[PDB]
């Protein structure tokens, strides 16, 4: 009936349609009223924000137009939606006469957060006509400014009679009174602004490294600015992978701080309304690293969830899958189905993903269960696909190369902000990966200067800085997954291991597992691999007893969250016995990787990981035995001569 100038929105039609959709819609559990229960749970718990999947609107017939209205005119539609939600809430509470205490709901505020806007084409592909629309983005957080106070109400005082006023901001402008509003006092221009008596809101700016799905020819990465307000501040940390929904904005900027002249070319940014921090293609963040942030989220009444929710049926399925007697082989085979065999490599990858148990001593002291692995072997094997897959499955991590890095580029640096024109501190690769896995390729090309900084990271999971202006110690709780190629052309089995890898022998002892990926010619294995690889081109799309990636991630995340194994004396005896065996066995030098205490630590970590898998809380003899077997098999001591340190190509099994 009565539309709004500039738009086509009618308030009455929109509110009626939204109410009807709220009161009649089911997910077609799929036959029950979907949103009635969500509102009921909201009021039982007292939450104030409703997350609206905009895709749910395209299902109902009425709201096939409200979808486009929301995508085109978010400003009016969101306010209409909030008011309609409050009205529906009062109707629900009163129409059934539950409890006469309804003042709180009638006084508080509500809000709606769209979170499934359609697929976009990237920030840089937008045009001027797309300003003030609803869009979504993917990217990586880099920096965040401190909280900015943003005034909403100004407090004036009269300098002759103490009369005090209050003025509310109006589209970003304050109207200062030109005369005291008293009859006794009417002095003109006598009102002064007391800043400390004003009311301020919360504001912050985030720097985002966008990761669009489609990339044109010759396009390099860039950065974007995001504005978050009120309860969403401090909800993102550098290194987080996020999905964001917001409005596309523009604004002119002043040329200098003295004049009030503006520039014709505008500056673009995004106003955020919802942030998604979870996915079904990767593991959930390690909660042992965000202990205080969850508490702060609870204190701040922000409804962003860090970990995915679990249904009862999902937990039941998890238990049944964990109850079978082929669990280890099945889980290993699930990892990277497009990679053939490599049973022990995949077992090591799975154990690294699970991780060991973190001890935290009262009165100070920290042990961590991060597991480090080095991959050495013939150049043409599939040891970089592994790094790619592990990078894409993990929640945090950076994929670096040894020769294309630097000591400063991995730790921290200072840069001048192009907007504020001041100097700020940024993070390096190893701190951006805290709580995740850092993949290093061609580890043997890294300079000694560059390699120097890995010692502290792998020996205390921290880094120290002594630079101009900054002196502090940082957390580096990240796992290392490296790879190396042999000296020359191929791994020569007529020489010791230390004559094939271009690293100091002492360095090779700090890893938990070392793999020798050898390539042997056997017609059966060649036939198998060739058939496996040629089956992938039978049809234009992939179709390859394997669990789906979503269930695998859910299972591993649940196991990491909810199981914490502990070692027993039966395991202690075997641990000490095996360590003494390794130390004694092999006892004319630099022929083999000498055993050290790091090996005992590695056995502890691997046994804890094996116990943590399969939902056990106690480490036992089988766990330690499997850990020792895996450590021995990775370096394949079975085919090695204890005296000369050579390898027999006939005793090695594909």
């Amino acid at each position: 009936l009565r539309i709004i100038w500039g738009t086509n929105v009618s308030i009455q039609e929109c509110t009626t349609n939204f109410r009807n959709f709220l009161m009649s819609f089911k997910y077609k559990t799929d036959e029950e009223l979907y949103y009635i229960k969500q509102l009921n749970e909201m009021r039982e718990l007292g939450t104030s924000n409703l997350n609206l999947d905009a895709r749910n609107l395209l299902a109902y017939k009425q709201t096939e137009d409200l979808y486009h209205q929301l995508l085109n005119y978010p400003q009016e539609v969101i306010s209409i939606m909030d008011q309609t939600i409050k009205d529906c809430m009062v109707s629900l509470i009163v129409d059934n006469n539950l409890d006469y205490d309804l003042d709180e709901i009638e006084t508080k505020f509500y809000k709606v957060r769209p979170y499934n806007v359609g697929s976009c084409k990237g920030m840089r592909e937008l045009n001027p006509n797309d300003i003030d629309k609803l869009i979504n983005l993917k990217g990586l957080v880099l920096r965040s400014t401190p909280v900015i106070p943003d005034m909403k109400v100004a407090f004036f005082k009269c300098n002759v009679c103490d009369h005090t006023m209050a003025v509310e901001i109006d589209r970003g402008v304050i109207q200062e009174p030109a005369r005291c509003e008293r009859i006794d006092c009417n002095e003109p221009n006598s009102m002064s602004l007391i800043h400390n008596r004003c009311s301020f809101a919360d504001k912050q700016v985030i720097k985002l490294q966008e990761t669009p799905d489609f990339v044109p020819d010759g396009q390099t990465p860039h950065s974007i600015s995001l504005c978050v307000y009120d309860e969403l501040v401090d909800s993102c940390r550098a290194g987080d992978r996020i999905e964001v929904t917001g409005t596309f904005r523009s604004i002119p900027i002043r040329a200098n701080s003295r004049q009030r002249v503006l520039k014709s070319l505008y500056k673009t940014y995004v106003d955020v309304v919802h942030v998604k921090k979870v996915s079904d293609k990767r593991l959930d963040v390690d909660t042992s690293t965000i202990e205080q942030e969850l508490m702060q989220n609870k204190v701040d009444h922000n409804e962003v969830e860090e970990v995915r929710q679990i249904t009862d049926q999902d937990l039941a399925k998890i238990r049944e899958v964990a109850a079978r007697e082929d669990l280890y082989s099945l889980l290993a085979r699930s990892i990277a189905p497009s990679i053939y065999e490599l049973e022990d490599v995949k077992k090591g990858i799975l154990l690294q993903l699970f991780g060991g148990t973190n001890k935290t001593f009262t009165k100070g002291g920290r042990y961590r269960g991060d597991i480090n692995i080095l991959l050495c072997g013939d150049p043409s094997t599939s040891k970089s696909q592994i790094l790619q897959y592990v990078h894409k499955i993990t929640p945090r991590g950076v994929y670096t190369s040894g020769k294309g890095s630097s000591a400063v580029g991995l730790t921290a640096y200072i840069t001048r902000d192009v907007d504020t024109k001041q100097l700020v501190l940024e993070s390096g690769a190893l701190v951006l990966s805290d709580g995740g896995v850092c993949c290093i390729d061609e580890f043997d090309k890294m300079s000694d200067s560059t390699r120097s900084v890995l010692h502290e990271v792998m020996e205390q999971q921290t880094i120290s800085i002594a630079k101009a202006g900054i002196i502090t110690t940082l957390n580096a709780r990240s796992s290392i997954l490296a790879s190396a190629n042999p000296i020359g052309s191929r791994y020569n089995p007529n020489l010791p291991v230390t004559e094939n890898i271009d690293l100091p022998p002492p360095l090779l002892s700090r890893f938990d597992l070392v793999y020798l990926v050898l390539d042997k010619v056997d017609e059966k294995n060649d036939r198998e691999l060739a058939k496996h690889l040629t089956n992938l081109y039978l049809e234009d799309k992939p179709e390859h007893d394997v669990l789906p990636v979503e269930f695998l991630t859910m299972y591993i995340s649940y196991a990491k969250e909810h199981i914490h194994p502990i070692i027993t004396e039966a395991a202690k005896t075997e641990l000490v016995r095996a360590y003494v065996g390794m130390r004694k066995m092999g006892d004319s030098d630099e022929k083999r990787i000498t055993a050290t205490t790091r090996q005992l630590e590695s056995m502890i970590r691997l046994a804890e990981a094996h116990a943590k898998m399969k939902l056990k809380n106690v480490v036992e003899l089988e766990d330690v035995q499997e850990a020792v077997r895996l450590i021995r098999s990775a370096i394949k001591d079975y085919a090695t001569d204890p005296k000369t340190g050579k390898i027999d190509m006939n005793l090695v099994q594909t």
Binding site: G218, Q388, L432, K531, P542
Partner: protein, 344 residues
Amino acid sequence: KKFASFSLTSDVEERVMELITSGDVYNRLAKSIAPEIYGNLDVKKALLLLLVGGVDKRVGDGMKIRGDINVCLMGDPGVAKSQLLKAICKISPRGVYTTGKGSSGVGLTAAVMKDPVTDEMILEGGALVLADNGICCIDEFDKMDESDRTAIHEVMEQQTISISKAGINTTLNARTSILAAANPLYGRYNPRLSPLDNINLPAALLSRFDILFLMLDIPSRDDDEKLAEHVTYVHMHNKQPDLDFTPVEPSKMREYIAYAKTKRPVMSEAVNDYVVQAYIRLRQDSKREMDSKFSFGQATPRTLLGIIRLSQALAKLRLADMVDIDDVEEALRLVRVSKESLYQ
């Protein structure tokens, strides 16, 4: 014209249909690449296949397999490698040409600078980013620095460049093909030394090429006559000497390649059986040669992937929806031709 902007229409369709009707598309296109250079036919076929490319496959779970073909030429001085490099760079719509130490550091990859127009920071792409979805030609491949070699290594590996330095932590897109040229370590090739001792590059880097050609200069009173006749005729006039063959101009070649790039042939079962048998036989044979220290590199799964890519490229050039045995025949034929210079 860019390939992505392709579109069928009466005008383009008539020219294309004429080209197919004339028959012998493969050799006719192959012989038109740098027609002022005598001989060098199989290298030209490999270059044409590098122009066309293979098929990119999305395997699922985020895994990725390239479809671009990398070719390396390495031979004695005065064999016209640079002419072929430059001609290929000129034919390609997004081609770039580089030579050794003239381009280094941020000349490759990208650097950080400030935009004059806008007040924001940006990255300017180097040689490897300017030729994205094109051909990157590298001359004097053996005289480069280690950092450039590592960058090329990664680009051939996974079509990306990772940088972690002061003020930059990002990953670039490098969907480009590599065409390199190199020289033996002592000038001319020395048949008294192992093949891996005649070159300065690591063996793995050489193994990372689909096709690796050896071009030696063995004097012969017969072929020298033909080469001299060709060159001196080319200098007397401005054209090539053959009259029974007409070369196709670059625009028509570009049009036909753009049309061919829209196809995506698929693997049947008999072709797969043939491929597995050939792979087994070749892999078994190569080990004995490499034990005698007479092989640039032992066969590995990358050889099988290169064979598959070349078969796909030939199928695409034929304008067919399926692959046949003859395509795999030609792929193996070329991969065998790659090394006659080492058996004379």
